Design a protein around this ligand. Structure first.
Ligand code: CLA
Ligand code: CLA
Ligand code: CLA
Ligand code: CLA
Ligand code: CLA
Ligand code: CLA
Ligand code: CLA
Ligand SMILES: CC(=O)O[C@H]1CC(C)(C)C(=C=C/C(C)=C/C=C/C(C)=C/C=C/C=C(C)/C=C/C=C(\C)C(=O)C[C@@]23O[C@]2(C)C[C@@H](O)CC3(C)C)[C@](C)(O)C1
Ligand SMILES: CC(=O)O[C@H]1CC(C)(C)C(=C=C/C(C)=C/C=C/C(C)=C/C=C/C=C(C)/C=C/C=C(\C)C(=O)C[C@@]23O[C@]2(C)C[C@@H](O)CC3(C)C)[C@](C)(O)C1
Ligand SMILES: CC1=C(C#C/C(C)=C/C=C/C(C)=C/C=C/C=C(C)/C=C/C=C(C)/C=C/[C@@]23O[C@]2(C)C[C@@H](O)CC3(C)C)C(C)(C)C[C@H](O)C1
Ligand SMILES: CC1=C(C#C/C(C)=C/C=C/C(C)=C/C=C/C=C(C)/C=C/C=C(C)/C=C/[C@@]23O[C@]2(C)C[C@@H](O)CC3(C)C)C(C)(C)C[C@H](O)C1
Lengths: 214, 163
């Protein structure tokens, strides 16, 4: 196991089951049944692989957390909260602190995005419940080679391999980063712009005034 | 009785008759016991530290008696109503006799080598947590007496950043 270099992995952890198969699985819960834990829509049929189900789990989490990162920076930096609400500055642009932004925004848009991801997972289950064989992260049509939407994916199988690698890695690293940003802002009551910009500056306490010299 | 439960500190620590005799007749029972004790005391230590920075906002007696106000440490025991802790324990005892959640099933495979090593490490950690719970309770009560009889006032003497 090169990730955990001086250690052994599961008696049956695979190297080709998922792209991210460097062997990192210290407790390696992959070994455990990883089945329809508490009846997780049990199928007993193809049922993918229990490892592959944990893989779909990591994929969903990392994808959501990746989007979450940009939703922690762009509200501040990129677009500077283009809330541009017809009225009601609160629950809009004004709350640039992401935690406070959630604190304000009415349950209208909350239920909007809730039903959005609800239809998302409804279609995901609709695929995967039938999409046996290779569940392949419940891919279905979503930007697949058939490209169920615009610019239907036009790449090569080697490019597809590299792209799977890109996605998986970025999702894992973003799963770290979202934790980062969240604990940051909560334990500072600010937004990332605040601490990072006074950091890249010179404190007002010491500035050597200005070059008022003759 | 020289089974798992021994390491470099002592090959069989039992400076009394305690070990010898009841050969596999009390040794397994004592393993059950020490296991349960060490696990619970580990949970205790995690208990003490976690109320110091975080606090779940639930109102134990609805309307009032909100977690955010009850003292941490031993003082909660005096606070927590007798019957309230009785109901809490009754849930715990049902859990012990029903396996309700708390990983009701699922322990992976863990081949016998790694499994034995994990079990030994478990025993050692829980044993240590027993002593950790001891020191904590000691300090707490002693301070409760003369406010800073021990000296260092803040409850968790180490981990100074918390307090
Ligand atoms: C519409 C409701 C709904 C349903 C039926 C499911 C159903 C499922 N989700 Mg899911 N999920 C939902 C909403 C839903 N999710 C939302 C709103 C988010 C955010 C997630 C985030 C999510 C993650 C991150 C993961 C699942 C996973 C799963 C599977 C277990 C199962 C198929 C797992 C696969 C997994 O790891 N879900
Ligand atoms: C996990 C993803 C995620 C989630 C849950 C939210 C959630 C929210 N966003 Mg958001 N956002 C995201 C990603 C996300 N965003 C991304 C990727 C971008 C970049 C395009 C933005 C850009 C964005 C803007 C510009 C604004 C929000 C706003 C809001 C809030 C309404 C709500 C709390 C609004 C807000 O309250 O602030 C708002 O004005 N978002
Ligand atoms: C590094 C970026 C990246 C790359 C190269 C790919 C690459 C690919 N994705 Mg993917 N994807 C990504 C990010 C990425 N994805 C993100 C952030 C999400 C969440 C919105 C998704 C959600 C997603 C789904 C739902 C599906 C793909 C699919 C595919 C395919 C191809 C291998 C398909 C397989 C498929 O159906 N992707
Ligand atoms: C909580 C009560 C409790 C119980 C029932 C046991 C029970 C046992 N201990 Mg033990 N132990 C405890 C607390 C306890 N221990 C604590 C707090 C310490 C730290 C001082 C130790 C340190 C300890 C050592 C170092 C060893 C035992 C050993 C043993 C076993 C044979 C005696 C038996 C399973 C021995 C064993 O497993 O063999 C052994 O080598 N224990
Ligand atoms: C009230 C229900 C109940 C019942 C029937 C038992 C039953 C038993 N406990 Mg027990 N125990 C309980 C609650 C209960 N426990 C609680 C609330 C704790 C504290 C978390 C413990 C902590 C405990 C330890 C440490 C040990 C036992 C040991 C034992 C066994 C001797 C026996 C099977 C010894 O092995 N118990
Ligand atoms: C031996 C384990 C143990 C024991 C006896 C207690 C006991 C207690 N905890 Mg506690 N707690 C524990 C472990 C434990 N905790 C752990 C491991 C955590 C971290 C998840 C917490 C996190 C915690 C919070 C956040 C709060 C309490 C609070 C309390 C008190 C109110 C009742 C309650 O919520 O119980 C449970 C009570 C004295 C109070 C309160 O708000 N606990
Ligand atoms: C890195 C920050 C830090 C600092 C400055 C201190 C500082 C202190 N610790 Mg401490 N401690 C720390 C982290 C820290 N601890 C951590 C992470 C642990 C867990 C292993 C402990 C466990 C610990 C114990 C068990 C004890 C102290 C004790 C002490 C005090 C005397 C030494 C001193 C106030 C002693 C008082 C004491 O008995 N600490
Ligand atoms: C037709 C269709 O729809 O199909 C779709 C398929 C699909 C795949 C959706 C498509 C695509 C590609 C997509 C969406 C790719 C998205 C990738 C995304 C969004 C990847 C974010 C990563 C963020 C990470 C890793 C973390 C970074 C940041 C980290 C780790 C930090 O260090 C943050 C740090 O902040 C702290 C923690 C503290 C600060 O003190 C210091 C700094 C600032 C340094 C298409 C093309 O749209 C088509
Ligand atoms: C299948 C399923 O669903 O899940 C799985 C999940 C998983 C993980 C696999 C499972 C497991 C195993 C688990 C959960 C193991 C958990 C182990 C755990 C939680 C172990 C804590 C040890 C803490 C110690 C030793 C603390 C010592 C602390 C000590 C010695 C101190 O110094 C205390 C000190 O206090 C003083 C005295 C003074 C203070 O001034 C300073 C401090 C505070 C520092 C299960 C059960 O199989 C179920
Ligand atoms: C969109 C948005 C919001 C949001 C949001 C949300 C919901 C963000 C959520 C982010 C989320 C959901 C982040 C999850 C991280 C999970 C991690 C990091 C797991 C790591 C687990 C690790 C590192 C463990 C690795 C292991 O090796 C270990 C240690 C033992 C091994 O045996 C087994 C394995 C291999 C497992 C607000 C706040 C609502 C409004 C705001 O305005 C913007
Ligand atoms: C967490 C929390 C609370 C709590 C709690 C709870 C439930 C805490 C539980 C604590 C618990 C369960 C603590 C066990 C200790 C067992 C010990 C110390 C055993 C030692 C035994 C020793 C040292 C024996 C050593 C021997 O060598 C001898 C001497 C002779 C040899 O022949 C045999 C051996 C080698 C064995 C409060 C207080 C209710 C409220 C608060 O707010 C929050």
């Amino acid at each position: 196991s090169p990730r955990a270099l001086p250690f052994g992995s599961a008696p049956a952890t695979l190297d080709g089951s998922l792209v991210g198969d460097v062997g990192f699985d210290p407790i390696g819960f992959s070994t455990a049944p990883f089945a329809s834990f508490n009846n997780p829509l049990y199928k007993e049929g193809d049922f993918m692989s229990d490892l592959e189900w944990l893989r779909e789990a990591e994929l969903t989490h990392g994808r959501i957390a990746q989007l979450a990162v940009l939703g922690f920076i762009w509200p501040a930096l990129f677009g500077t909260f283009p809330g541009n609400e017809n009225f009601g500055g609160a629950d809009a642009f004004s709350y640039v602190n992401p935690l406070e932004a959630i604190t304000h925004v009415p349950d209208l848009a909350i239920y909007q995005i809730v039903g959005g991801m609800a239809w998302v997972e409804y279609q995901r289950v609709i695929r995967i419940k039938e999409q046996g064989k290779n569940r392949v992260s419940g891919d279905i049509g979503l930007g697949y080679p058939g490209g169920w939407n615009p610019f239907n994916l036009n790449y090569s199988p080697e490019e597809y391999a590299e792209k799977q690698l890109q996605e998986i890695k970025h999702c894992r690293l973003a799963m770290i980063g979202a934790f980062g940003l969240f604990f940051q802002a909560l334990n500072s009551g600010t937004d990332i712009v605040s601490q990072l910009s006074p950091a890249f500056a010179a404190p007002d306490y010491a500035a050597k005034a200005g070059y008022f010299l003759p | 009785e020289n089974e798992i439960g021994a390491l470099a500190p002592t090959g069989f620590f039992d400076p009394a008759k305690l070990s010898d005799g009841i050969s596999q007749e009390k040794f397994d029972q004592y393993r059950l016991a020490e296991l349960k004790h060490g696990r619970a005391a580990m949970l205790a230590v995690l208990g003490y530290v976690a109320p110091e920075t975080y606090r779940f906002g639930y109102d134990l007696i609805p309307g009032e008696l909100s977690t955010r106000d009850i003292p941490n440490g031993v003082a909660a025991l005096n606070a927590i109503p007798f019957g309230g802790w009785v109901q809490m324990i009754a849930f715990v005892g049902t859990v012990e006799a029903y396996g309700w959640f708390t990983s009701p099933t699922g322990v992976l495979d863990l081949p016998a080598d790694i499994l034995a090593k994990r079990q030994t490490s478990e025993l050692q950690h829980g044993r240590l947590a027993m002593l950790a719970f001891l020191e904590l309770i000691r300090h707490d009560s002693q301070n409760l007496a003369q406010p800073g009889f021990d000296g260092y006032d803040n409850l968790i003497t180490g981990l100074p950043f918390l307090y």
